[PDB]
Amino acid sequence: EWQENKSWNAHFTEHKSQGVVVLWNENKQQGFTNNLKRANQAFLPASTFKIPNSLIALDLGVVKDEHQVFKWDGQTRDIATWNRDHNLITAMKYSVVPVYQEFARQIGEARMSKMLHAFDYGNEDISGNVDSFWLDGGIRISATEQISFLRKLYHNKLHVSERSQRIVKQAMLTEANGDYIIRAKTGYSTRIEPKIGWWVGWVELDDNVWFFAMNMDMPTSDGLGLRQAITKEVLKQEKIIP
């Protein structure tokens, strides 16, 4: 069911990095990782939490649809793309934390906690501030747990409406060409050690889907592009993408 391929460690070592990639072949129901231990270690989800947060916000009507405009609150922040109006699509694309912090406040602790339990999401623990717990609270999730959650989303099996799941999968669209479609979400956790980058999602092919979840040590923001670059090198090595 599970196979360890340490040859992928070369892709981290080449960049003086360390991390884990987890792949799941949906047709064959087989998983692959370079590091079985780290594949099951739990980290803060950081902005990968925007996936469940979007689902919950949509299903509760906090977000009407993917066109609803969340106006900039006029507070200048140091990421220029955040100092502007957003909808669900652009808020996901630019990982707009303050938009999602307001979602969480409107969702509220009780409904957030119940929904994460229904999703079987990570350690399901929202201890901390309702508007920051995915950044510095008690919630934790492993790469294998990310894949379990994403597989449910892909199959519309989460306990929210089909509509909510379709909208979030639309909002996850990251790349598409004639060979594959990637729906995914990045994350960068810095408030609690170890600092890590995330990329989780899946690759749609004509006749299969490959789920992936990676995290890697990320001491500075300078290496954030390696999240996608390393993942894609693994995908290329395994002949999943050209």
Ligand SMILES: O=C(O)c1cc(-c2ccc3ncccc3c2)cc(-c2ccc3cccnc3c2)c1
């Ligand atoms: O994971 C990522 O790819 C990433 C993470 C962050 C991010 C995530 C969570 C945080 N939580 C608390 C405080 C600051 C946080 C910052 C920001 C950006 C980002 C987004 C839009 C940009 C547009 C232009 C230039 N650069 C940009 C950088 C990317």
